Amino acid sequence: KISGGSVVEMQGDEMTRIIWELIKEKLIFPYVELDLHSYDLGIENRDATNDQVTKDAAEAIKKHNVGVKCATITPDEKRVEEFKLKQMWKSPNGTIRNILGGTVFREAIICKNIPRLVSGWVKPIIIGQHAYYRATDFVVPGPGKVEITYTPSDGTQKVTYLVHNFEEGGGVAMGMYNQDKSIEDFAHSSFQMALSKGWPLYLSTKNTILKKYDGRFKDIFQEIYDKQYKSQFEAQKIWYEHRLIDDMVAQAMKSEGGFIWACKNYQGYGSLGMMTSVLVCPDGKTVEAEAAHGTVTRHYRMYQKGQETSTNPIASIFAWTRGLAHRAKLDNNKELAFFANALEEVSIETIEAGFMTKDLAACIKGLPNVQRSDYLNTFEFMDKLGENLKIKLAQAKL
Amino acid sequence: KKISGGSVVEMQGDEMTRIIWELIKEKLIFPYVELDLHSYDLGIENRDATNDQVTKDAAEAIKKHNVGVKCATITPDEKRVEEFKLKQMWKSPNGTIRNILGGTVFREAIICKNIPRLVSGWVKPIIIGQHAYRATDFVVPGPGKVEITYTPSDGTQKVTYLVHNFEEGGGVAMGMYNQDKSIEDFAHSSFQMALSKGWPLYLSTKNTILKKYDGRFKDIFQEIYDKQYKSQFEAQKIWYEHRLIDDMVAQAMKSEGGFIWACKNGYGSLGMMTSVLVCPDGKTVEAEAAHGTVTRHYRMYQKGQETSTNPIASIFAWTRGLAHRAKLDNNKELAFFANALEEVSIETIEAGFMTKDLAACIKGLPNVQRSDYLNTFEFMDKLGENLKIKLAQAKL
Ligand SMILES: NC(=O)C1=CN([C@@H]2O[C@H](COP(=O)(O)OP(=O)(O)OC[C@H]3O[C@@H](n4cnc5c(N)ncnc54)[C@H](OP(=O)(O)O)[C@@H]3O)[C@@H](O)[C@H]2O)C=CC1
Ligand SMILES: NC(=O)C1=CN([C@@H]2O[C@H](COP(=O)(O)OP(=O)(O)OC[C@H]3O[C@@H](n4cnc5c(N)ncnc54)[C@H](OP(=O)(O)O)[C@@H]3O)[C@@H](O)[C@H]2O)C=CC1
């Protein structure tokens, strides 16, 4: 077996909890031994520990640099009643993101025989937004001037901008800000992401409206690029380029994918089971990977009733491969790195060979026309993945 | 005899849409409807020659007559100023008109059974109304205080909020506002939109974060619904509900369309995107296509090259305006004609006759053959033939 090293694992809820264990038993543990720091973020354990397990897991990722998380229940009124919760606990992902900070990158796994939004997309597209509300909103009770002013610490200037003169009645108003350091982090993660995946980085803004707000982003990116990054980019045939929201969307419809897209926003096509997410810290050392979808409660309800389920494990699987990939990069572990990529290859190869779960079959043929013989159920698909994994690894040996 | 349509304000536009606009009036409207046409030429040359006076006048006419249908217009930039030697960079005509009329813009894509849509589970299009810029942004060069103050006009105590204290480094800051009247109008237009279409209404905000800012939207929407629209909504078996933006995106993706989405704050064929400005009064509306003047196709047409521009959005501007005019005047004949024009457009495409953009949505642009679509004039002639036939069969 491979010596994988230190990995922080977080267990989840409902259907993903089941798939998670299938992944560990069929795909990971037979080939990788890990110094595994496992945390049970199941809803009942989070309630029992008064959410302490969530904080402990966050600190564990901070210490060991690699975290892979299963989907978790974010409680609401119904969940509080269903589980007899003591509190409507905050989402584990919010707690973890707030402890680690960083930038989230979403990337949908592409298979040739699965329709994409843009027919021409051959390579993936990695979209990134910064994990930051810290905004001061208030009620304007009646007529009067709302103004926003800046005063430098040296007190040599004072600038006052009229936000609005309320002359008929009141309303609402707010102010919000952004620190340079937070914009710089967003850019560092974004450039390191483009270098890691070996693709070009595009930044899109709306400088035609918030000329000053978005212009600061444009400048901070260009500064960092031309300073510490331009070199590596020209080396790998990649580059950085700023785009307006229109020029960017256009360049995407005509493009073949294969680029990082940084957004200053203030999730659709392709089954949710194909979407991956990665929290990348500015330091470039810490990564937390996980599927972009949820616990799949509906499929779990079928399971509980004893009905066949067909749940896509790809996003969950790619959470492990990304985490193991980063762990291998940190440890210079060529064997683990080879495994992580082999597992990714096998998943796509199996789907592209026609073995797939119902969601993907529906994407191809349309749900009203899918037949039982068009797909595999949850356990059949995991079986096929494990079978092709064993073949692939053994064949690589020769 | 033709139908007596009444008073309509019409606004002529630029480039490709101007060509198609005239074909629409000649082939689909005028052969069947007589209008008291208040017609204004918002072509770039006429706006310049009148110093944009025509644009303001058109807005006043809509205010007076309640119904307006507008062709897409060139919004000037530096390149347009050079191309036409403009006296100056005239403001977007839509900006002038919205400023004069107020109201909320609602966007709706026209759904054809045989054109693939974003979520294949959307049977009926979804109508999205948006709010408004009005953001005072600026750069923070270095350490210092950014504060936002409220100064009452009656002399009482000034109120000051800290936005942020930049202790080291700089960044950016911005201020933003919303007047209560503005939110009330947004709600009223939205409720009227939902009643008119007979569909449910959903307001999406982030009132859990912006507790006071977005909370004001949700509160005003609810108070106006309970006092002015609850019963009417029930009398049509519809409803209004607030929803957090995340939950709303969830409900929408699993839904089959058919609802109005008001959100404070999408890639189909632009040729199928419709737009309507709905004033809160419930009387005045202005309809236009969601796309622009299609300059690229116009350059083709200028060199005598074959074009295939989609007129659907332009056609639905006319049908929505005429439908509102019919409602205002209790004009059963015009109401039917407007419905017939919309169905004939949908049916022609659903029968396999379409412009190149929709053929691309089916075969993909790389494999679109000339025999897969009609050019602009071929498609317009096909619509005319089918409209003629439908209206003949409608007598009995
Ligand atoms: N990262 C996290 O921890 C996340 C937490 N959640 C939690 O999970 C639950 C969400 O349930 P829901 O709102 O249904 O969102 P889910 O993403 O859990 O399920 C959404 C729906 O999309 C389809 N789908 C999603 N993942 C898969 C998959 N792997 N294979 C096949 N189909 C899939 C299914 O639709 P169909 O049944 O039509 O196939 C499923 O019902 C809540 O408790 C929420 O708090 C949700 C989001 C993220
Ligand atoms: N309501 C208004 O008055 C509006 C004004 N404008 C003005 O109009 C011009 C806009 O030009 P542009 O920026 O190209 O935006 P357009 O929407 O005019 O053209 C956009 C592109 O989308 C496709 N497209 C749009 N409408 C159609 C259609 N009816 N049938 C087929 N394809 C269509 C074409 O792409 P392809 O050529 O690849 O098919 C077209 O080149 C500018 O002068 C702008 O100021 C723009 C926005 C709204």
Numbering used by the authors:
A (entry chain A): 4 to 135, 139 to 272, 283 to 414
B (entry chain B): 3 to 134, 139 to 271, 284 to 414
Sentences reproduced from the published study:
While R132Q:NADP(H) showed no major global structural alterations upon alignment with previously solved structures of WT:NADP(H)13 and R132H:NADP(H)30, local shifts were observed. Unsurprisingly, NADP(H)-bound R132Q had the typical open, inactive conformation seen in WT and R132H, with a larger active site cleft and smaller back cleft relative to the quaternary complexes. These distances in the binary R132Q structure more closely resembled binary WT than R132H, supportive of a more closed, catalytically competent ground state for R132Q. In particular, the clasp domain and helices proximal to the substrate and cofactor binding site were shifted, with the α1, α2, α4, α5, and α11 helices adjusted upwards and inwards in R132Q versus WT and R132H, resulting in a similar shift of the NADP(H) molecule itself in dimer-based alignments. Importantly, this inward shifting of the α1 helix is a feature of closed, catalytically competent IDH1 conformations. R132Q also contained longer, more intact β strands in the clasp domain, which plays a major role in maintaining the dimer, compared to WT and R132H. IDH1 R132Q also maintained an extensive hydrogen bonding network enveloping the NADP(H) molecule; this network was far less robust in R132H. Together, dynamic and static structural data suggested that the IDH1 R132Q active site pocket and surrounding features have greater rigidity and more defined structural features typical of fully-substrate-bound forms of IDH1, suggesting a more catalytically primed state for R132Q:NADP(H) compared to R132H:NADP(H). We now believe that the more activated, quaternary-like state of the binary R132Q:NADP(H) complex helped drive inhibitor resistance. Instead, our alignments showed residues 111-121 in the inhibitor binding pocket, which form a loop between the β4 and β5 strands, likely had a larger role in the loss of affinity towards inhibitors for R132Q.
